Amino acid sequence: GFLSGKRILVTGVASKLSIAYGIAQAMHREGAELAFTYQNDKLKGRVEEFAAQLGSDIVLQCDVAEDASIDTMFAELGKVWPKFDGFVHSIGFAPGDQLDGDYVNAVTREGFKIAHDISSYSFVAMAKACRSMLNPGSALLTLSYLGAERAIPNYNVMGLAKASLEANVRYMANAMGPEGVRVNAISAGPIRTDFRKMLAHCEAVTPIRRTVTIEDVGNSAAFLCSDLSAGISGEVVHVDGGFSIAAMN
Amino acid sequence: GFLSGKRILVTGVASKLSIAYGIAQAMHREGAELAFTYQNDKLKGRVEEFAAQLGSDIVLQCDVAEDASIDTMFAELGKVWPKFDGFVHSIGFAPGDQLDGDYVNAVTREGFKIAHDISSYSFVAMAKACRSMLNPGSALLTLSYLGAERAIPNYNVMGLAKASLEANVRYMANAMGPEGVRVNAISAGPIRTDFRKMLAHCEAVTPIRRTVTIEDVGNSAAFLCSDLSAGISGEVVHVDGGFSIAAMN
Amino acid sequence: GFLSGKRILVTGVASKLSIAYGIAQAMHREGAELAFTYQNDKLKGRVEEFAAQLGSDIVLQCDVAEDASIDTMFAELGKVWPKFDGFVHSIGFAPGDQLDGDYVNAVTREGFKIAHDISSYSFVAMAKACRSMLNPGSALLTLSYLGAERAIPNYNVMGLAKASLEANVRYMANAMGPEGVRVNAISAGPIRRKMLAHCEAVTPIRRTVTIEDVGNSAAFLCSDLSAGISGEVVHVDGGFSIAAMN
Amino acid sequence: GFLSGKRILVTGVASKLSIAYGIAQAMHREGAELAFTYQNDKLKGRVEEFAAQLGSDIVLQCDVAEDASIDTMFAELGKVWPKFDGFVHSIGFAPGDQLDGDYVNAVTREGFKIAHDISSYSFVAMAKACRSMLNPGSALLTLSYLGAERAIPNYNVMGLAKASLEANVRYMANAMGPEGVRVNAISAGPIRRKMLAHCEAVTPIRRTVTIEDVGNSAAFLCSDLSAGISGEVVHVDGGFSIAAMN
C-alpha cells in the first residue's frame, strides 16, 4: 500500500475505539511497519496485544511528562529502528476539574501548566528526542480539535493547549522542513464512542450529516504520513465532515 | 489503487506540465477511470492524445462560459457514464491586462465579471448540471491559490475570484453533503514551469525548501477525490510545502 | 470629536434604521462633515431629510451598476469637496431568487454576476473614480457578513460576493496604502426572529449588535485613531463567530 | 474623551517607549483614570514618575508568576477602586535561551512552561482575581503578535504562548461576556533593523506602526465605542499580515 517502506511509531493507542488505534489500523493496512508506546503498567498488556494484531512486537514504555522517559524510549526504539519515518502524537490531557463549567472559574495555574505540557510540549519533546533518527521524507502528525480555534463550552484550558499545539505544528514544520521532515495536524470532528446532545447536534449540522469515524481519521492520518502528502506541511487539516465551515444549519 | 471503482471527469488538461494533467496521471495510477473536457478546437487533439495515454476515450467539448455547452457536455458524458463519482475543476482565467501592476488601476468591471464568472461561477455551474448524475460518495475538487487569502502583487482581480471560489467550496459542500457529495479545494503553491524571482523566493522560504510539483498536487487531488478523504468536506487544503504558514524566513 | 476636519461620503442610507445611517450618525457626532448618495429619484427627498439631520446638504444621485454614474457623482461631489477623506460603502444586493433554499439549486449565472458586481466590484469602482480626490490619511470602509467565511443557509450567493468583497479589501489596502489610504471592513452581526433568538443566546455578549455599535466601530475605522489598521476585516458581532456549540 | 468615567488598570509600563505607556497615554488623553502595576522594587519610583505624568498615583507591586501577589495587588487596588472597568495586559516573557536559532533545538520543557505561564496564563489569572470587581461594560485587553499565527524565525516558543494567549482571549470572552465583560487583543506589528527594513518595505501603509497607533486602538477597544467587539484579535500592523510577496 502507500505506506510500504515506512516505519512509523504510534503513541496513544488505548482501546480499539481510540483514534490512535484507527490510525494504526489504517497505516498497517497501507503497508507501514509500526511501533507503539504505552504510558504505564495498566495499559501495557492491551497495547502489546493490539500491536501483535497489527504485526508488531515493538511496544515500549514512554511517559511524555518526563524528558528521561522519552530519551530511553528512543534509545530502545533505535536498537530495532536505527532510523524511521515519523510518528503519530495522540496524547492530550487536562486534570478533570479543568473541563467542567465556566472556563475562567475552572482554570488554574497548575491545570494550565499540565494541559500545555502534556498536550503541546510533548509533541516537540518527542521531535527533539528522535530528530537525528528521522529519514528524509519523514512526517510527524498530531491530533487537534476545533476548540483550538473557537471557544467551546467545557473544553476550556484544553482549547488553549490545542492552540499552542497547532502553533507548535507550524514552528516544527518550519524548523524541520529543510532536513526533509513535514509536520501536520488533523483537527478531528467529535467521534461517537452532555456528549449525547453534542453528537446529535453535530450530525444534524455537519455537511456530510454524520460524525467522522476513527476509520476516516485513520485514512487521513495515513495520507499525511505518506509520500502522497509530500506537498503538505505545517497544515491543520479539518477532518470533521465540514462541521467548522458551516453556521446556523 | 485507492480510486478503483471511481469515474472522475478532469477539466483543464492543457499540456503535460499542467496541474490537471498531474492530477489525471495520479488518479489514473490509483485506478480511476477518467473522462476529459476540452475547451475548443485548438486543444482537442492534445487532450485526445493525453486521454488515450491514460486509458480513456471520453474527450468532450465544454466551454464553461456557456450554460448550454455545460449541459450538452453532461448529456454526452451520460451516454457512457449514466452516473459517476465527481470531477476536477481546473479552470481559471482573467483578461491579461487585469494582472499587471497596481490592482485598483488594472481592475475593470468587465475584467472582474469574466474572472469571477470563469474562475468561480463555473465550479457550481458544473455541479448544478451533473448533480443528479453523482453517486453517493462523490467528491468535487477545485484549485485555488494563496492570492485568495493574501494580497499578492499582480494577481489582482484573480485573488477576489479565488476568494469567491473558496466560499463556493463551502456553500457547495454545505448544500451537497446531505446527498453524499464532498467538495474541497487545493490551494497549490507556485509550480516551476517576475516568475523566476518569485520562484527563487518561494524555494528559499518554503519550509520544505522547494516548490511543490504537479505530482505532489496530483497525489493530494487523488486523495481528496477518493474514499480515503471521506471525513473532509468544505476544506481548502494548502499544498504549498508550508509556504503560507511562515513569515520572514 | 475624533473625526474633526474629516469629509466622509456615506453610501446606502435608505432609512433611519439602516446600518449606514447608524454609521453617519456616529460620524457626525464625532465631528465629520458628511455627504450622501441615493440611487433613484423616488428616494431623493427622504435622503435630503436624513442628510439635514446629520448636518449635510450634499445629497447626490449615483447608480453604482454604471461606471458613468459613479464618475458624474464624483464630479458633482468635487464641486463642493475637491478633496475628501474617504467613503463608507454599504451596498449589497442579490436578486431575491438567489437567497432562498438550497444554494446549488438557487444560484444562476446572472444572479451570481449581479451579486458580485453590486456587492463587491462597486467598492473598487468607487475607489478608482475618486482616487485622486482622496487626501493622505484617508480611509475606505465596507460592510461584510460572516457568510463570507462560513456557509450560512439561504445566504447563498451573497456568501461568495462577500468573500470577494473581503479579498477586495485586502487588494485595495495593498494597492492604496503606499498613497496613504487605508481600506478595511466590518463584518457585522445580525441586527434586530428565530435567527435572532439563536444569535442572542449564543453570542458572548448575549445580545445582537446595534447599528449604534456598528456605527461606533466604523467611525473609529475611518478616523486617524485606527491609523495602524489596514486590510482588516473587524468582526463586530459581539463575539458570535468565535464561539461554537454555545 | 471617549473613556470618561472609566478606571483602567495598566500592566507592563516599564519605560516611556513601551507599548503599554503608549496605551496609557492614549487612555489618559481620552479621559480614563489609570492605575499601574510594577514587578520589582527597583522599578517602583520610575513607575510613579510615569503614573504621575498620566494623572495617577495608584502604583502597585505585582508579580504575575504568583497567585498570592496578584490577589494582594487587587486587594490594594480595591482600597482606592472597589469597582473598575478593566485592565490592559502587556506582559510576555520567555527565557533568552528560547529565542535564538532553530526552534526545535532551542525549546526546552521549562522554557515552554515559563513562556506560557507568564505570557498566556497570567492574563486569565488577573481576570480570575478581579472578576467580581469589574463593572458591567468592562473590557480586558491583551497584546499579541503575528508569531501566534505564522512561524517566524527566532520567535520560537513565544509563538506557541501567543497562540495560547489568543485562544485565552476567545475562551475568556465566551465565559465573561454574559456578565457584560469583553475581552480582545491587538496583534501589534513590529515597532521601530533588517527586520524593520523588510517590514517598512512590505507593509501596505509603508511604515511600522507606532506605540501611539497601538495606544489609539487599545483605547478604542477598552471604551464603549467597541461595545460590539469581543473575542477578537485585531491586527494593528499596517496591513503587514494580509500581504504576501510584496
From Swiss-Prot, chains A, B:
This is Enoyl-[acyl-carrier-protein] reductase [NADH] FabI. Substrate binds at residue 94. NAD(+) binds at residues 12, 18-19, 39, 63-64, 91, 162, 191-193. Pfam families: adh_short_C2 (PF13561). Its EC number is 1.3.1.9. GO terms for biological process: biotin biosynthetic process; fatty acid elongation; lipid biosynthetic process; protein homotetramerization; response to antibiotic. The active site is at residues 145, 155. The gene is fabI. One of its GO terms (cellular component) is catalytic complex. It is an enzyme of class 1 (oxidoreductase). Changing residue 155 to F: No effect on substrate reduction. Changing residue 197 to A: No effect on substrate reduction.
